[PDB]
Design a protein around this nucleic acid. Structure first.
Lengths: 154, 62, 115, 71
RNA sequence: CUAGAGUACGGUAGAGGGUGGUGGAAUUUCCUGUGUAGCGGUGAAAUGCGUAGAUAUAGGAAGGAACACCAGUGGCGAAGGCGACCACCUGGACUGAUACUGACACUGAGGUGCGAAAGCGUGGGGAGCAAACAGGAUUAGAUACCCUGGUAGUCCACGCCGUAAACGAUGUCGACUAGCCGUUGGGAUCCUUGAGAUCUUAGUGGCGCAGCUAACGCGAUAAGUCGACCGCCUGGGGAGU
């Protein structure tokens, strides 16, 4: 495994003037349906401005940082015993963990009018009663039972 | 024995003074009995690893 | 009840670690073990669990005072030195650290070798 | 050459029959714990190293030198 | 006759034997105080041990065997073997000087002895370890490995048995044959301060030229060049029966 991987960049959001939202828009697109997914992300953006008077970017700015975790396990097996090691999440990685958890719980929300499913997800995570926040903190609890394996056979 | 002055100094004066005295490898060889033939293998293999080390270093000392 | 200048005994096997706070008279004040902190297995033998049980012995020792400690470390296992760094974390003046180790000059013969 | 001069700590002088009485000599050859030193550290000649080990074991018997840090 | 061999005289070095005695650390059982929920074990568990107060921890008593560090391609012994300290008897080897005996030597079929360990007989003694065995686990199955227990035995006195990869897979004895680096013990010579120097015997190791060897490899501690006596081999199974 010679190290090869360079970096490709996508940063385009002219109708709002943002950068995090464009990368979040790519996690919603299925099979290249970009124009469909573009009006749903704005469709769940204006309902927050309908709901809260604050600029809904900052609601999205707050909802990331209550779904984004800090440490997580890593099942590195010693070759004769299956161990798990709580590891520090790299700062570049920890953005995409929240955005990928957020969409997958929006699809099982079970409402009508699809942009209302994602609307309720970004409202809860500014408070903490979301299922993504409950899925965040449970994996946080898995690390301290794992904390004995932090350095030793790790 | 290690007396005390910060605390990190007296730790490394204790981790090292135990090892420089011993009584840590000797404990590790009290948990299985070696028959005296197997204790004549340590006496055999370590004597080879010392007299060959006096000659392989001379190649570096060329 | 008030006593000062106690003695901390640390017993460290390959599978468990037992910490006991005593006096100069050799009387029990507070004992705490690695299994009582709820590990019970492969996690039991870690030097992290020798910090959890070390401070928990250092909290029922403030019932009687004991602003000065004298540490005897005993055993081959891991957590042999990690437990000392978890003592003055509770705020105890550690005076001196001392190895006590049972080493027979010839002794009885040990059990046989595993296969 | 500290291991070289200690060979001459017994051979340069006519102190061939060492005694278990000069504790000022014997404390140079005992480690901090109590166990006896090797002969590749002092570098003493192996005629005297065998003779040095008897004067330790007799002085240890008369409680002039300890065994361990326990007692 | 004195070059082989042996004696008398100084002198060193050694776990070489046998008979008693005395230590210190650690393990276990027991007693007593404090103290209170687990200990122990393992890829992971379970059998087991625990409030009828364990582990831990301190004090005390009894008893049994082994003898850390020094300790090393180091020593001694005919080989097996031999490591605490002291007394007690007791064998042989090294090294120097000097006198004496004057070949008194070598090997050895038969025969005589000393023979690890397991085992066997009568009597002691019973700390740990541990075949047989018991239980748990693993396992299609597991008498096995691993875990918790556990008896003969291991220890001592007296007597027996006689085999082992009893090994340097090389019988004992004697004489010649380039070198170099180590090491035990002992005299030398030497300028002398040596971390000295070189030479010489008695051991014990690492490389190496001639030479030999089917090859690997030995090579002044020969499997090289030669002598003296002895033991033994003759295709594989059947059968060391």
């Amino acid at each position: 495994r010679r190290r090869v991987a360079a970096k490709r960049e996508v940063l385009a959001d002219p109708k709002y003037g943002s950068q995090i939202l464009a990368k979040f828009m790519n996690h919603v697109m299925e099979s290249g349906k970009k124009a469909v997914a573009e009006r749903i992300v704005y469709g769940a953006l204006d309902k927050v401005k309908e709901r809260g008077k604050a600029d809904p970017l900052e609601t999205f700015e707050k909802a990331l940082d209550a779904i984004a975790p800090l440490v997580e396990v890593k099942s590195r097996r010693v070759g004769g015993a299956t161990y798990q090691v709580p590891v520090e999440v790299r700062p570049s990685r920890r953005n995409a963990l929240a955005m990928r958890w957020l969409v997958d719980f929006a699809r099982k929300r079970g409402e009508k009018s699809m942009a209302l499913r994602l609307a309720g997800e970004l409202l809860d995570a500014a408070e903490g009663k979301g299922a993504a926040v409950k899925k965040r903190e449970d994996v946080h609890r898995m690390a301290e039972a794992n904390k004995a394996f932090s350095h030793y056979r790790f | 024995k290690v007396k005390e002055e910060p605390f990190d100094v007296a730790l490394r004066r204790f981790k090292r003074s135990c090892e420089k005295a011993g009584a840590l490898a000797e404990v590790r060889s009290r948990e299985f009995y070696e028959k005296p033939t197997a204790e004549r293998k340590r006496k055999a293999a370590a004597a080879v690893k010392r007299h060959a080390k006096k000659v392989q270093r001379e190649q570096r000392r060329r | 009840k008030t006593v000062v200048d106690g003695i901390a005994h640390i017993h460290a096997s390959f599978n468990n670690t037992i910490v006991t706070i005593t006096d100069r008279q050799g009387n029990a004040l507070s004992w705490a073990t690695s299994g009582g902190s709820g590990f019970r297995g492969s996690r039991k033998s870690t030097p992290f669990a020798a910090q959890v049980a070390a401070e928990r012995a250092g909290q029922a020792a403030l019932e009687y005072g004991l602003k000065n400690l004298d540490v005897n470390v005993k055993g081959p296992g891991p957590g042999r030195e990690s437990a000392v760094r978890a003592l003055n974390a509770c705020g105890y003046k550690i005076a001196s650290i001392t190895d006590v180790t049972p080493i027979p000059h010839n002794g009885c013969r040990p059990p046989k070798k595993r296969r | 050459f500290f291991r070289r001069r200690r060979f001459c700590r017994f051979t340069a002088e006519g102190v061939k029959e060492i005694d278990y009485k000069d504790l000022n000599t014997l404390k140079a050859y005992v480690s901090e714990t109590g166990k006896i030193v090797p002969s590749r550290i002092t570098g003493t000649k192996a005629k005297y190293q065998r003779q040095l080990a008897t004067a330790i074991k007799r002085a240890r018997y008369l409680a002039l030198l300890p065994y361990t840090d326990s007692h």
